[PDB]
Ligand binder design. Structure first.
Ligand SMILES: [Ca+2]
Lengths: 19, 305
């Protein structure tokens, strides 16, 4: 299950230098 | 990162001023509720002037500080990234819930985090990082053993030391953990961020265990949210007393904010004072206050004290 970690993970993937 | 001179500081000042101008556009409609970048960037600028004022003359020691270099580098990247957001996001910046708009909000949150961290490691403009006193003793002992008296450490090293003490199952878990603890989003972990995280998911003895049960799998977790967003989300269950969600506040780092509806029903908020989150959630559930995580009928049994 996931919830608001989805939001932070999505934000991370979209905005960080990654991976 | 290279040593910080007053020149680069002035360059960051120019970039911050540019971002401020880009955000001063009337068609943007600035919500005064945090994070408010039009207040963030000037406060950062003023605090930076305070640091320079106290380290005037002795700029040699200020430019050699590892955290100050990492911070200035990060500030450079983030401001430049925001300018790029406006540059490649032409018309879309003037909408609602748009991609570059939401990105701007997220970056604003980052600026808020960086300002808090800056005021934390440089209180009153004077450096206080090699003089750490982490709130949690166990976490402080871990940091003392792993990195000694260093103020900031690269993410890889932190992941190594943490895995030595608290085993990380997957790289996915490490990524989600990274998205949670790396507030400044600069691939670094400071004593400030470490203090925040370890206060958030206490006790230390079962840190990653609490994080898996309070953040990863608990449907009540909402990460960082505004009070208005909490209100608007719990509004769909204003007729279902006991429904609750908890969040993190960018104005109150290190503390949880539980929002719940009543039997009247009104929406109220509770902030635990140095209690483990699961303790307050269990107590609240046994008293009929925290019954439905995000409106869901089934509440997670967190009785793993
Ligand atoms: Ca960081």
């Amino acid at each position: 299950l996931s919830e608001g970690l989805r939001e932070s993970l999505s934000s991370y993937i979209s905005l960080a230098e990654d991976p | 990162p290279g040593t910080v001179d007053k020149k680069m500081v002035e360059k960051c000042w120019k970039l911050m001023d540019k971002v401020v101008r880009l955000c001063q556009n009337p068609k943007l409609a600035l919500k005064n509720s945090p994070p408010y970048i039009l207040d963030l960037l000037p406060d950062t600028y003023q605090h930076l002037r305070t640091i320079l004022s106290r380290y005037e003359g002795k700029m040699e020691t200020l430019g050699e500080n590892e955290y100050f270099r990492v911070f200035m580098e990060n500030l450079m990247k983030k401001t430049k990234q925001t300018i790029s957001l406006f540059k490649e996001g032409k018309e879309r910046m003037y909408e609602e819930n748009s991609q570059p708009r939401r990105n701007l909000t997220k970056l604003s949150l980052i600026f808020s985090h960086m300002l808090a961290e800056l005021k934390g490691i440089f209180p009153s403009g004077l450096f206080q990082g090699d003089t750490f006193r982490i709130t949690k003793a166990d976490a402080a002992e871990f940091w003392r053993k792993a990195f000694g008296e260093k103020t900031i450490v690269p993410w890889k090293s932190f992941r190594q030391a943490l895995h030595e003490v608290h085993p990380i199952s997957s790289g996915l878990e490490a990524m989600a953990l990274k998205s949670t603890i790396d507030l400044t989003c600069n691939d670094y972990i400071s004593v400030f961020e470490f203090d925040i995280f370890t206060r958030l998911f206490q006790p230390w003895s079962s840190l990653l265990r609490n994080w898996n049960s309070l953040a990863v799998t608990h449907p009540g977790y909402m990460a960082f949210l505004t009070y208005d967003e909490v209100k608007a989300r719990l509004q769909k269950f204003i007729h279902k007393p006991g429904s609750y969600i908890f969040r993190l506040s960018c104005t109150r780092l290190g503390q949880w904010a539980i929002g719940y509806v009543t039997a009247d029903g009104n929406i109220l908020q509770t902030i635990p004072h140095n209690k483990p989150l699961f303790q307050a959630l269990i107590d609240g559930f046994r008293e009929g206050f925290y019954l439905f995580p995000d409106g869901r009928n089934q509440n997670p049994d967190l009785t793993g004290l």
